[PDB]
Amino acid sequence: VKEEIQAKEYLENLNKELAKRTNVETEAAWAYGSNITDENEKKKNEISAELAKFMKEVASDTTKFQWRSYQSEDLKRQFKALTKLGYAALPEDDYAELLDTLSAMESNFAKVKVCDYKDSTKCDLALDPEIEEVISKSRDHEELAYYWREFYDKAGTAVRSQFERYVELNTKAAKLNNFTSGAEAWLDEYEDDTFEQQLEDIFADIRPLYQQIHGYVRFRLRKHYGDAVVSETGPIPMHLLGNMWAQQWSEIADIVSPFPEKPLVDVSAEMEKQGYTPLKMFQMGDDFFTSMNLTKLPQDFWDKSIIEKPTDGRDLVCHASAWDFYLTDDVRIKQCTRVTQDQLFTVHHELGHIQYFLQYQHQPFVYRTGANPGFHEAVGDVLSLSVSTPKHLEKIGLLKDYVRDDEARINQLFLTALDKIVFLPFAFTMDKYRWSLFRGEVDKANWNCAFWKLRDEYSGIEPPVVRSEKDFDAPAKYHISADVEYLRYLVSFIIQFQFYKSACIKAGQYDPDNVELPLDNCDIYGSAAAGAAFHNMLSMGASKPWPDALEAFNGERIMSGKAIAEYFEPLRVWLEAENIKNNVHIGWTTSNKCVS
Ligand SMILES: *[C@@H]1O[C@H](CO)[C@@H](O[C@@H]2O[C@H](CO)[C@@H](O[C@@H]3O[C@H](CO[C@H]4O[C@H](CO)[C@@H](O)[C@H](O)[C@@H]4O)[C@@H](O)[C@H](O[C@H]4O[C@H](CO[C@@H]5O[C@H](CO)[C@@H](O)[C@H](O)[C@@H]5O)[C@@H](O)[C@H](O)[C@@H]4O)[C@@H]3O)[C@H](O)[C@H]2NC(C)=O)[C@H](O)[C@H]1NC(C)=O
Ligand SMILES: O=C(N[C@@H](Cc1ccccc1)P(=O)(O)C[C@@H](Cc1cc(-c2ccccc2)no1)C(=O)N[C@@H](Cc1ccc(O)cc1)C(=O)O)OCc1ccccc1
Ligand SMILES: *[C@@H]1O[C@H](CO)[C@@H](O)[C@H](O)[C@H]1NC(C)=O
Ligand SMILES: *[C@@H]1O[C@H](CO)[C@@H](O)[C@H](O)[C@H]1NC(C)=O
Ligand SMILES: [Zn+2]
């Protein structure tokens, strides 16, 4: 159609206008997250309401263009993106109420403080860093159960009524966009109507390995705490797993390591000894990206980022985040950085988001986002996989006197699995839970025990104390309180191994027939070949359906669990044999810790 001329001019101006309007909303959201006050809350929400009103007008104006009739797939793709209003489809008053509900939940989470286990006078312990410090380090099971209960009562139960209204308005918004529910609204980002089934299939392939790891960990925990604390046949008490949500278990590696007399990589002490700071950690992340011929952090990043928890009295959101301001080179991180191994990896994860921002900033506004949400989460994790290798850690002087024999290799593979395999059922359940509420599949009388039932069924973990429908535990996880879709992380954990394997081959760092080049010791630091693949993919933003973006990276078009299974194959062989040798019980009875 000749109208395509025009349409192209229309999109040109509109994209530029959206970027500028979104810059303004983003600044107000940054100010609030950096400094939680009633005044900043009001300002964030009023500017969002303003932009929502404009979006309503945009979606309306698309109907004046015959865009479905156009020759250009590119023009059609842009118009389609503009018709998708999300929450902005809601009536003015409903949108304002939703924004008020969202900030009530996020500020509740950020403001949680508990009393010291040993000093009921001292009541200023926050999750980050005080409570997380205990959960990751204490081996006093009663102390752990105390902090678990205090946190969940305050971050979870306290916001049930707000969470209920959020579900209602989220559903109403989805239906105004003609999605069945918000589950379908979220899934739309993956542009694939078999996406859920694809993930069920990949998950089913990896589940048996998870069950072997679970069995071995439970066996080792029984030896440490005794059978009064940990049963052989039941779900693992979750507070013993070194993470408030039991989402990753690497913090208890020193008590569950396959070979306790051989080295286990933990560089936190060496980081401190060498005088590492948050600034140094970010500079090192920047170095990694630039070493691969990727983009250096701009001056705005250094000038405007927050890389340490503020020491004034203020309330803020400490959960780490990366921010795109939709201009040129105005990108920032807010991280309450600590000097630990886990935090070094976290820094690289966040800088992965920043790199993606810089790579696609020349794209039209609607294309300035990930190919799918899993792509955005994957970027930094691919580098963190290299950072975590004995190979890399020796290069930067953090790992000393390391002998990489067969036993040390198993220890390192197991340590990696405690993050990478353990996470998979966890991440699947965060969205299976919310989807089921969104879809109206669970009665409100059953909402809490529906959460714990999924945690049991998929992860084989349970609360430390008996819960019931008088509690409401799901919002005790940040993303649930903050209305952040979680499937992105499951997709990320699968595809990051496809990216890592390919980048390692391109770097000459992995050859399956060369004993000297194992995938689990690959360091892509300094590889321009690996960097080129990233540039080819990331610079696309969301200009093409995601299989096109994967193709740009390594010639493949299919999400596949083959690469993650390849990485862990030596661990699988060893672990299956070890569990047989030690008569380790696999599987678990149904939990008794959530009362109907
Ligand atoms: C989610 O799904 C919803 C449906 O469940 C959908 O809502 C529908 O959107 C339609 C707009 O696309 C709308 O259709 C219009 O209907 C008008 C009259 O409807 C009235 O009576 C209904 C009861 O019978 C009531 O329920 C309504 O509230 C209304 O009061 C028509 O007058 C109108 O017509 C005009 O527009 C067409 C479209 O023209 C198109 O564009 C060009 C013109 O430049 C054409 O050449 C082209 O071929 C194309 O057809 C013209 O053909 C016509 O001449 C008129 O100008 C129109 O048909 C419908 O009413 C509405 N609701 C329902 C219940 O059907 C939502 O839009 C969906 N939401 C999202 C976000 O996608
Ligand atoms: O800033 C975010 N997202 C942050 C969350 C967020 C989302 C919306 C609004 C505010 C905040 P995060 O996931 O970086 C924040 C990160 C923080 C983090 C990272 C690591 C880490 C540990 C070891 C190795 C590697 C990483 N542990 O915590 C996050 O949540 N992670 C998930 C889980 C996780 C992910 C990866 C991983 O490797 C380990 C765990 C969680 O905390 O539950 O997104 C920016 C963006 C993405 C896409 C488009 C536009 C902008
Ligand atoms: C936080 O916001 C308040 C008022 O909303 C403002 O007075 C103050 O300057 C801000 N605090 C900091 C540390 O920036
Ligand atoms: C670095 O990236 C640029 C971007 O095109 C490329 O032209 C150059 O060849 C790359 N350098 C190397 C050594 O590959
Ligand atoms: Zn992230």
Side-chain angles (χ1 to χ4, degrees), residues 174-354:
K175 290 187 181 297
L176 281 164
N177 290 287
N178 291 339
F179 290 111
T180 304
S181 82
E184 287 74 24
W186 281 350
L187 286 160
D188 186 63
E189 306 298 328
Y190 302 95
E191 293 187 64
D192 189 328
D193 61 19
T194 61
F195 206 69
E196 291 165 283
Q197 194 51 55
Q198 280 177 64
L199 289 168
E200 297 284 0
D201 294 350
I202 290 163
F203 181 73
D205 291 338
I206 318 297
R207 193 169 197 170
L209 179 55
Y210 176 71
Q211 303 223 143
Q212 299 291 311
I213 294 160
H214 176 281
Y216 189 77
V217 169
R218 174 173 57 190
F219 160 65
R220 296 292 298 276
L221 290 170
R222 289 177 57 216
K223 299 187 72 165
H224 190 91
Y225 292 96
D227 284 58
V229 181
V230 182
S231 81
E232 177 181 34
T233 53
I236 305 173
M238 75 187 293
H239 65 311
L240 311 177
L241 291 166
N243 176 275
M244 183 69 77
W245 312 275
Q247 71 195 40
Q248 296 192 306
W249 307 344
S250 55
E251 294 280 9
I252 64 154
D254 66 290
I255 60 181
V256 302
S257 276
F259 301 100
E261 296 172 9
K262 293 289 175 73
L264 179 67
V265 178
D266 188 341
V267 302
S268 295
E270 279 294 333
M271 293 175 66
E272 286 192 60
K273 193 182 169 201
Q274 288 171 49
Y276 270 53
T277 60
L279 182 62
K280 182 57 171 195
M281 293 161 74
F282 280 86
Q283 287 168 344
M284 283 173 64
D286 189 30
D287 170 37
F288 209 118
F289 283 92
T290 63
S291 82
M292 299 174 65
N293 196 22
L294 291 169
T295 307
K296 134 189 87 180
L297 295 165
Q299 214 40 56
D300 272 0
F301 177 90
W302 299 115
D303 287 351
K304 295 176 186 191
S305 291
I306 295 168
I307 64 174
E308 279 186 335
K309 191 174 180 175
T311 49
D312 48 20
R314 90 221 218 182
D315 290 301
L316 75 151
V317 180
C318 261
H319 192 97
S321 65
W323 294 74
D324 188 355
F325 288 84
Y326 301 108
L327 306 175
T328 305
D329 289 350
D330 189 348
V331 292
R332 298 171 213 175
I333 282 166
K334 180 160 59 66
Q335 182 173 338
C336 300
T337 316
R338 293 162 293 106
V339 184
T340 72
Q341 171 167 309
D342 172 68
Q343 282 280 289
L344 184 60
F345 305 157
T346 300
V347 167
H348 288 77
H349 176 92
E350 306 308 325
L351 288 170
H353 290 308
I354 300 291

Side-chain angles (χ1 to χ4, degrees), residues 460-502:
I461 64 83
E462 66 181 20
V465 295
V466 179
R467 308 300 273 176
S468 78
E469 294 297 345
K470 295 173 193 171
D471 314 294
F472 193 64
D473 293 311
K477 178 65 190 156
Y478 173 77
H479 301 66
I480 300 193
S481 279
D483 178 31
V484 179
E485 187 261 22
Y486 215 81
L487 207 76
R488 60 186 65 181
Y489 299 110
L490 173 59
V491 177
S492 171
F493 274 49
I494 296 163
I495 70 176
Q496 71 185 238
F497 286 89
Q498 303 182 243
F499 295 146
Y500 183 69
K501 179 183 151 172
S502 288

Side-chain angles (χ1 to χ4, degrees), residues 85-91 94 170-179:
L85 282 175
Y87 294 163
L90 285 164
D94 288 344
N170 172 291
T171 306
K172 180 172 189 178
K175 290 187 181 297
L176 281 164
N177 290 287
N178 291 339
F179 290 111

